[PDB]
């Protein structure tokens, strides 16, 4: 016998969308954090960059 599910001539398909993974709720109990600092404000952390343009 042939397996019940085979063959699909119609519905050509579509290009898979760009994957957008989600942060792990199971593996991480919370949200992973980067730079550590006192940050006596709403929160900036130990990482702050900037690009000075012309």
């Amino acid at each position: 016998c042939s397996p019940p599910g085979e063959t699909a001539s119609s519905e050509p398909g579509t290009t898979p969308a760009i994957w957008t993974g989600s942060p792990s709720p199971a593996a991480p109990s919370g949200e992973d954090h980067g730079g550590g600092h006192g940050a006596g404000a709403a929160g900036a952390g130990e990482t702050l960059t900037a690009e000075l343009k012309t």
């Binding site: 994957w19 957008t20 993974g21 989600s22 792990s24 709720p25 199971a26 593996a27």
Partner: protein
């Protein structure tokens, strides 16, 4: 003799007998049996599983 043989054989073989369908492997849809799940089964919804080449 029949009861003792039954008990002894069952106690001998029950150590070996294991349920193939005990949900053990974690998955986004809760723990599932081993046969259903492989390394490609997302442990949590939306997990990224790269097709890593094995150098």
């Amino acid at each position: 003799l029949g009861a003792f043989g039954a008990g002894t054989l069952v106690a001998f073989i029950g150590g070996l007998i294991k349920n193939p369908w005990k949900p053990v492997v974690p998955t986004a849809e809760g723990k599932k049996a081993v046969l259903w799940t492989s390394g490609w089964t997302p442990r949590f919804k939306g997990e990224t599983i790269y097709l890593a080449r094995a150098t």
